[PDB]
């Protein structure tokens, strides 16, 4: 007979738990490469969030807005529909916090964060507006307001960490650590974070990915390096990985431009762009996939049922 070649892996990706009580979701824990359960264990499958903006999106493609059209102005109702669409976790992006936008304050954002958290049965991930100075101001307020719920706060970077990490330690939250597609940058940021005594199982690495055709292959390899680092004993690499799928996939001209004759049917290619990005990075060893279109989530969840079979 053929002797199946089984790697003996030294170590594992830590298991991170998000949420609390009956709201928890676990991810990571892998002692093997994705799906190869003949050589190790996959205690958890990949997990999925859908996005909710606190104030409605002004640039989205019509095909993206449609599935949400009835709830899209109400971040609470929207989040409930995400859960009904099959999301494991809801990702609330606070766009209104933007200084050139509505520029909402810490106190105000804090209240909207509570309202969403309160209305749903799953963990809540909270994303800032992307302006570091502003996000460092609002997160300590939001975290205190949500204290004890174990939200995922997104995110910490090499030049902005301490505020978001301190809120996690004081108020019982988990953090996303973002570094730009580099193994050593990601490690150096995990080290700084753990030096504040935030536990290793409270962290999730964000590679800052590109989508299909847009740098997905760089993302793919960084994520494989993250998994292989974890498995071979490198403990600084031993944390689960988040990819913001929807954020990137839906910026692609292929996803957002309804007339290109050469590219065929728009509906098909728009969704493929997200699903193919998702599956590629699932194959690469990603854990948490933050998506946008409920149809993309639905087909990927089906693919997963098949590949776990």
């Amino acid at each position: 007979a053929v002797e199946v070649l089984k790697e003996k892996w030294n170590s594992k990706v830590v298991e991170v738990t998000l949420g609390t009580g009956d709201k928890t979701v676990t991810l990571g824990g892998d002692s093997t490469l994705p799906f190869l359960t003949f050589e190790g264990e996959m205690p958890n499958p990949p997990r999925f969030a859908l996005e909710v903006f606190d104030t409605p999106p002004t640039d989205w493609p019509d095909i993206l807005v449609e599935p949400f059209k009835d709830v899209i102005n109400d971040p609470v109702a929207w989040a409930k529909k995400c859960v009904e669409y099959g999301a494991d976790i809801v990702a609330l992006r606070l766009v209104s916090a933007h200084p050139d936008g509505q520029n909402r304050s810490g106190a105000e954002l804090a209240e909207v964060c509570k309202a969403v958290a309160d209305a749903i049965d799953v963990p809540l991930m909270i994303i800032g507006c992307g302006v570091e100075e502003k996000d460092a101001e609002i997160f300590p307020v939001i975290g205190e307001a949500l204290s004890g719920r174990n939200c995922l706060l997104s995110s910490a970077t090499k030049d902005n960490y301490k505020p978001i990490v301190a809120t996690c330690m004081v108020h019982g939250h988990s953090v996303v650590a973002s570094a730009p597609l580099d193994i050593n940058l990601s490690k150096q940021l995990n080290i700084m974070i753990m030096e504040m005594n935030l536990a290793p199982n409270r962290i999730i690495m964000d590679p800052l990915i590109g989508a299909l055709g847009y740098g997905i292959e760089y993302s793919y390899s960084i994520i494989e390096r993250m998994r292989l680092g974890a498995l071979t004993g490198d403990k600084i690499l031993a944390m689960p990985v988040v990819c913001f799928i929807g954020q990137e996939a839906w910026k692609a001209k292929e996803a957002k431009d309804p007339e290109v004759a050469e590219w065929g049917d728009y509906a098909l290619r728009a969704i493929h762009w997200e699903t193919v990005t998702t599956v590629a990075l699932i194959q690469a060893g990603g854990h948490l996939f933050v998506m946008r279109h409920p149809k993309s989530l639905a087909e990927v969840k089906e693919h997963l049922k098949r590949i776990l079979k």
Binding site: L5, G213, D265, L268, H272, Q283, E302, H303, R306
Partner: protein
Amino acid sequence: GLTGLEIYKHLPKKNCKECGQPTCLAFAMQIAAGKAGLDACPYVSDEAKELLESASAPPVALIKVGKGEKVLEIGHETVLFRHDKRFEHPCGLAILVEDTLSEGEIKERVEKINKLVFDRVGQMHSVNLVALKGSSQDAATFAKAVATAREVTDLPFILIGTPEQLAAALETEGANNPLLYAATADNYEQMVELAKKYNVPLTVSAKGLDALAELVQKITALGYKNLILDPQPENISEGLFYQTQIRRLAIKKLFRPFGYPTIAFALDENPYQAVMEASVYIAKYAGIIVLNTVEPADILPLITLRLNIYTDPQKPIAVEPKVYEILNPGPDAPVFITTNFSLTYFCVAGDVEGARIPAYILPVDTDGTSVLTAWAAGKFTPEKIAQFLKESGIAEKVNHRKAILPGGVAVLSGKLQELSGWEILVGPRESSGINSFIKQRW
């Protein structure tokens, strides 16, 4: 590649002829010229087999399907992860065509297949093969189906049918070097003789790793090494397992029966499911993937994923950093500043021409890096861009002094205006906004 003499020293030395050859020394000579495999000698010790088989050689054979301009080459992969070293040969993509179709329908479908070709980053990328299937279960029909298809395309073929169907179609098609599908435990002697007769590559097909390896060994024993492997997964869980093992065992264990490229089918009637299974097979180790869809929107994502996965990170992708003209601009046309990463250049060129805007595009030399990448790296400077404006000759091509920055670099504008002497406009963050910017602001 060892000489018969070399490989003879380890043989049983019985001269019992059971391998088909007159003597051990002459058996070794048959294998040295690739006329027979080690598995043809029943008595060769497992030690000697390991010594001989573990001798230096590429772990995965390079197999060619087709000939001329349209030839496909796959194989010669040495690694399990692209960061270890690159993936060498992009997997072929094939589209199924069934011979139950009318002659007219066959031609129209193969015509559509010819159209799956796409510009990615200023290069054409296309589907490589037509897989003709003998679903009619009639030899004469299959043969006329293949001839008909060949009238409308230069793409190489995979021929899926019974030995009888294949033999009929090969009368015409054998000269185009098609891949045959497939030798099984039932038919392999007949399929190998047919393969040698036409000198064409041959798929070996059996269920699971055990049966695939035992079948390959009977076939290499008969001296046929031009081979593609089919473990017959029932779903994408079995496929990923089989593909991982076949690749691991060839490379890491030097396991020769697995030392060939594989074929994989994603035929699912749900296009999202088909595209996702194919995607897994692109990313993990499939030599050839066969699909059921002619819809460009289903193929575009797979073309692109194949391109990305099979890119060598070592190579910069860059355009000559000079002034480009779009739709014959006059002295009054807008001037767009961008970088020379080819992806970035063709994105911008694509939106400008798409909106039918005559214009100049100025890909500053970033060493092939994207707008924000080059910015973060200190490679898109006010000083650098200012030099381009001054020494590129654009100043003599336009009457006006205005140039337009990517919206994502807007913080550069003030210093650039001071250094260059040009009025600097900040355009949209995404080039998809150019059309509207020009209409409203230019």
